[PDB]
Ligand binder design. Structure first.
Ligand SMILES: Nc1ncnc2c1ncn2[C@@H]1O[C@H](COP(=O)(O)OP(=O)(O)NP(=O)(O)O)[C@@H](O)[C@H]1O
Ligand SMILES: Nc1ncnc2c1ncn2[C@@H]1O[C@H](COP(=O)(O)OP(=O)(O)NP(=O)(O)O)[C@@H](O)[C@H]1O
Ligand SMILES: Nc1ncnc2c1ncn2[C@@H]1O[C@H](COP(=O)(O)OP(=O)(O)NP(=O)(O)O)[C@@H](O)[C@H]1O
Ligand SMILES: Nc1ncnc2c1ncn2[C@@H]1O[C@H](COP(=O)(O)OP(=O)(O)NP(=O)(O)O)[C@@H](O)[C@H]1O
Ligand SMILES: Nc1ncnc2c1ncn2[C@@H]1O[C@H](COP(=O)(O)OP(=O)(O)NP(=O)(O)O)[C@@H](O)[C@H]1O
Ligand SMILES: [Mg+2]
Ligand SMILES: [Mg+2]
Ligand SMILES: [Mg+2]
Ligand SMILES: [Mg+2]
Ligand SMILES: [Mg+2]
Lengths: 470, 471, 464
């Protein structure tokens, strides 16, 4: 019988299984710069816009004018909401009994249903002991429940993985507790959200990554991804007809393609051909490059007889070039999502995934891979992902990150020593939903692209890289 | 000798070796959101539903009306219990320990209560009570409650998960019984555990045991309490591939765990699909737990193999449950399986795949999962088909990486074999407990109609390496 | 709308996405010797030099004369600026709150100051102040400086590098903006970093960015292509590469010790100077004398190239400094001499001590500078295994490289032979052969491929 109020924040409602309990107070706790103020403003803003519920923001430090100024770059009409008596900022820069009655006045005057208090810590630092803090928070919470308001209360922390608040009391008094974290690992920051406790209801458990973008907080609950993506038998072309034959008539549109192999095997070539065919069919494509600069890609592509500039000028090709270490993986994902949503491609390429794994948790990488994979299949975009293997010959593994099961189609490129010279080979290792050629065919790179020849039928141990002529 | 009172909480009595000591006080300690209040209510709720033992809940903060509303999420009709005078919520919250003890005592007498819950004592000692005060005052409360002869649950707060048991380093030593609820955050995922540290005068299970809070309240899964006592018959069940059945000595065993291991793309899913199809052809029910592919993909690929899961799902013989491994923790996944089984009640089940569920979990937490799902399948007499993808694509010297080979009864090893510069495939019945099996590493070819198993590579060596030599 | 003011500090405005918010206070916190003071003076100095905005520097310990003396090592004309009534240093050193305000207010007016630096606010409260008092007192100072309409910088002291952000656990929550300076000790080596933790109402780059302090102040360095060919100095290798190396490419020479990487990195260089072009060699393994002796035995006369003004050689042990400092040493020397071709021998040596993640940042930085400056770059990496190295690098920098030359030993008939292979060449055809070569007093000699053998890449072949 515990009902909830939508915050209007994308993903927070999902993690809360609907939103914050109505009539109750929720504690949002975090270190400096975690998004407590941003979240609290968000909560009020959506109240007034989407449900026409007036809201009150109580401030003990930040001036009203600064709060509006610091919220100006989220695209919200707060100034007008204030002018139209829909939002009231109460400056508060036997004090709690005074504050309580002052808030109560504003609630009744503006007929408020949502309240934000930011931050309660500042009040109790005055000179309150743990015994005093506990009784005083309980009063404020109880009275706020008496007026019949839904409240968001902000507290400060010092550590990321330590005391949830400051006095070790605020959490046990609050019905609902939210933790914002901003963790530093490998010189990079990662914002996350956790719902620790909602009394009398359910919620998602654990930390959920988030970003603060254009319209505010965006949460991507990886747990709230459903394994229900649609699947057709519609084919698309690789740009190499012999490969299309080997793949049983081309790749599926609804599929994830992995090209794996050592450096210089011809992965970038195969993605370039995959993108070319999109543009040749007058469809849009995006290439996310993390290894090469666009200028480099352009030269190399023109040396294969592929004109990327032409494709860009036609408005069919978008190339995004970035160093993996330039941001966190949650941010990388958001760039991929935002850039796809702007260009609405039918085909997408990542060159390479193995680059985005350098100097990252094996787990954090997997979370990234499931997300981009899941997004592509969800959005019905054909994805071609590249992976560079460390060992250049003999690698008995497809991925060092062990990601093979997520992909639908696996193209294995490899070097093969033939008569004191370095040759290459291509195999359609896996193809869900279709027959494929089982051959480890030779292929050569020319100035006009790849040429898949025939298997080395008179050789043994071809997969090792160092064969034996029978 | 100390007698025990059944709590009626699923799994708690097993870890307690019967229940909580009667006429004694049990400390329940934990950080915020561990489920201390839920445990307390459950204890009292079951007291009155099962044995008609009236209960008293002493609250120092939460209002009676909130406790009832917060309990509604479990479907306990506590409002009726309060009206019928079987549950009493004593409000000891601020006016805006001898006196409290006297109120509690006479409340017990009025309602003839046999069980009491005090939530939380920490709050009352965060007035001004010091180490010597808290100790003397808890002792007073505990001693008196033994005088009345009531079984009491007492709640305390903590800051850390693996630090002091309570706040003042005193409550654990004065209490006769100590339970620790933990909500540990490893990685970015939370795992609820319960531990019984100490039961004076009695025995109990030791260490941490996972638990979940569901629709009927707390549910504890102690693998330790699970016994090696599952049945074994000679009843056979068909794979769906007649040549494989011959290779297995006349089909799989019903009371068995089938493991298919192999590199990606070998055809593990194809074999799962056949195993399920067969049940439905014999008008038997089967569940598929897919953690890699979606219903749409699963059905498109099945139709490419000549399998209609839709017809089976229409006839109520097939239930496909697709979900990412990241959606929940393993303990929760285990529950979802058991629940969905207990609903659909199948003859066969499939997990495609176990290797997916080992993603981002410890080796022991996965084992504990494997022991659970296997043991559950075997003690419910349901044939189980499990898949495992291997990290190496040719020449894996190990069957599994997680060492789950001993738990499985039948092992099917799928591999790639390079023949004439082309990737062929081979199938082997590596192990078959209780039966003869073909020892051949026999080639197979995936077609539109399904798998077609052929002859062994009798003119080759080093076949298991995946890179053979022609003789 | 929140507006930012350029600091003019190299890279800080990039990481600040414009600069520090105008008319607000930014907290700069760090342990001792991080560079709080140097950062604050750099803020004021650049205010007068670039935007002609006067600045005030409040000090509670350091003397004005010492501050100017300490600023001397950056070439900052603070002497003139004080004389020209541009910079004024308010000495609040012992021989209160309301007092210091009025003084600064007067100075702001008297000197028409738009920038103020306070260093250090900790010291003031190091008289006495409970958490409540500190918070209220800082809140006032900020609230007032906001009224005056000044962009302020405030210094605070930390005890640990990854601990609390300030001292009293309060300063971060009052300030609108918080910058953290760190000086982390790891492997007996120190590394300086800057982080923008929080900018209320605006965006900023997230995380730690490395910085150095040169002779102009703080340098923060956060993270086309032609078909013009250049010669290797080995005709046969040029043919193997499809007509030589591209002038817009990174060349890696990978192989075991003694394979001939230094020879190839010598021929390249000699070829530049033979074309009357400048080149630099950054050595971290051998001395200039050793290099000269061995070059002479190979037939290459470096001494002439240095004298003819077409070759510089910078030799330094990797342990000399740190990666971030090493990178600056390259950058500086490149701009000074202005080469056509660069050469590092070796990158494997510069990877000693540092972390894999720490090294990867060096390579990208160095790689980017060459391509940015349009300089051909020849790099060497020594592999750990002398035979059977089925891995190009252990550092995984292959993707960053354009051209890969693999040198390996091969056992032929109880004898140790050598082979070279153009493993990779982006934007060009190359020879695929694993060709034998021999080192002589005339230099290398690329011969034929071992067509009659198998398993050559292994190093232990089989005569078929
Ligand atoms: N119906 C339900 N189903 C699942 N989980 C639930 C349900 N009801 C409550 N919970 C969970 O139980 C948590 C609170 O349990 P509760 O026993 O009140 O915690 P506690 O340990 O008493 N907290 P605290 O008072 O701060 O010490 C909620 O945050 C939910 O995660
Ligand atoms: N014009 C050309 N003619 C013939 N071969 C060429 C030509 N241009 C490039 N190549 C070959 O193509 C290779 C580069 O292929 P590419 O697609 O970049 O491989 P990759 O596997 O993506 N490399 P990497 O990302 O560095 O691991 C070169 O090493 C040459 O062997
Ligand atoms: N219609 C078809 N005709 C022929 N071969 C097919 C057909 N459909 C699928 N295949 C083959 O069957 C393979 C898929 O088998 P599958 O059972 O999905 O393998 P798996 O080992 O379960 N893969 P994974 O889940 O990634 O570990 C494809 O890679 C093809 O080689
Ligand atoms: N208008 C905006 N546009 C974009 N990002 C913003 C904006 N406002 C704030 N941010 C980001 O959010 C951070 C601070 O969010 P905010 O909610 O003010 O933090 P907080 O947790 O309330 N800080 P504190 O008061 O110290 O506890 C900034 O450092 C920015 O990274
Ligand atoms: N006069 C000479 N005649 C023949 N061979 C010579 C002569 N001088 C040097 N060498 C060879 O050249 C090798 C040194 O080549 P060099 O280019 O220094 O290798 P490297 O791979 O850079 N070594 P290192 O720096 O230790 O990793 C010696 O081991 C000899 O085999
Ligand atoms: Mg704030
Ligand atoms: Mg590439
Ligand atoms: Mg509770
Ligand atoms: Mg200083
Ligand atoms: Mg050398």
């Amino acid at each position: 019988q515990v009902q909830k109020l939508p915050t209007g924040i994308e993903g927070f409602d999902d993690v809360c299984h609907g939103g914050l309990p109505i009539g109750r107070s929720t504690l949002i706790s975090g270190t400096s710069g975690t998004g407590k103020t941003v979240f609290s403003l968000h909560f009020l803003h959506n109240g007034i816009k989407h449900f026409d519920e007036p809201g009150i923001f109580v401030t003990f430090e930040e001036s009203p004018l600064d709060i509006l100024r610091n919220a100006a770059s989220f695209g919200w009409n707060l100034q007008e909401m204030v002018e139209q008596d829909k939002l009231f900022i109460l400056d508060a820069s036997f004090d709690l009994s005074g504050l309580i009655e002052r808030i109560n006045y504003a609630i009744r005057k503006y007929k408020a249903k949502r309240v934000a208090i930011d931050s309660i810590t500042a009040v109790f630092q005055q000179y309150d002991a743990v015994s005093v803090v506990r009784r005083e928070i309980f009063r404020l919470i109880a009275r706020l429940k008496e007026i019949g308001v839904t409240t968001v209360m902000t507290t400060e922390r010092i550590d990321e993985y330590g005391p949830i608040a400051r006095y070790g009391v605020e959490e046990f008094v609050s019905d609902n507790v939210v933790i914002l974290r901003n963790v530093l690992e490998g010189e990079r920051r990662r914002r996350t959200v956790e719902i620790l406790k909602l009394r009398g209801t359910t919620h998602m458990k654990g930390e959920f990554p988030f970003t603060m973008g254009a319209h505010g907080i965006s949460i991507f609950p990886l747990g709230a991804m459903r394994l229900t993506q649609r699947s057709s038998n519609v084919r698309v072309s690789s740009g190499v007809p012999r490969l299309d034959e080997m793949c049983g008539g081309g790749f599926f549109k609804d599929s994830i393609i992995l090209a794996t192999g050592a450096t210089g095997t011809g992965k970038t070539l195969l993605v370039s051909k995959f993108i070319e065919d999109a543009c040749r069919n007058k469809e849009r494509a995006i290439l996310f490059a993390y290894e090469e600069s666009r200028a480099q890609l352009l030269r190399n592509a023109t040396s294969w007889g592929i004109d990327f500039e032409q494709m860009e000028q036609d408005g069919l090709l978008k190339i995004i070039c970035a160093y993996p270490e330039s941001t966190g993986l949650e941010d990388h994902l958001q760039i991929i999502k935002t850039e796809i949503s702007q260009f609405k491609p039918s085909r997408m390429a990542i060159d390479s995934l193995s680059a985005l794994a350098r100097g990252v948790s094996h787990n954090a990488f997997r979370q990234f891979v499931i997300g981009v994979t899941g997004y592509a299949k969800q959005e019905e975009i054909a994805g071609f992902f590249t992976n560079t293997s460390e060992e250049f010959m003999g690698s008995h593994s497809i991925t060092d990150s062990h990601i093979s099961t997520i992909t639908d189609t696996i193209l294995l490129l490899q070097y093969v020593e033939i008569r004191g010279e370095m040759a290459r080979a291509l195999n359609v290792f896996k193809m869900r939903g279709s027959w494929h050629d089982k051959g480890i065919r030779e292929f050569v790179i020319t100035g006009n692209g790849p040429e898949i020849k025939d298997s080395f039928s008179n050789f043994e141990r071809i997969i090792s890289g160092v064969p034996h002529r029978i």
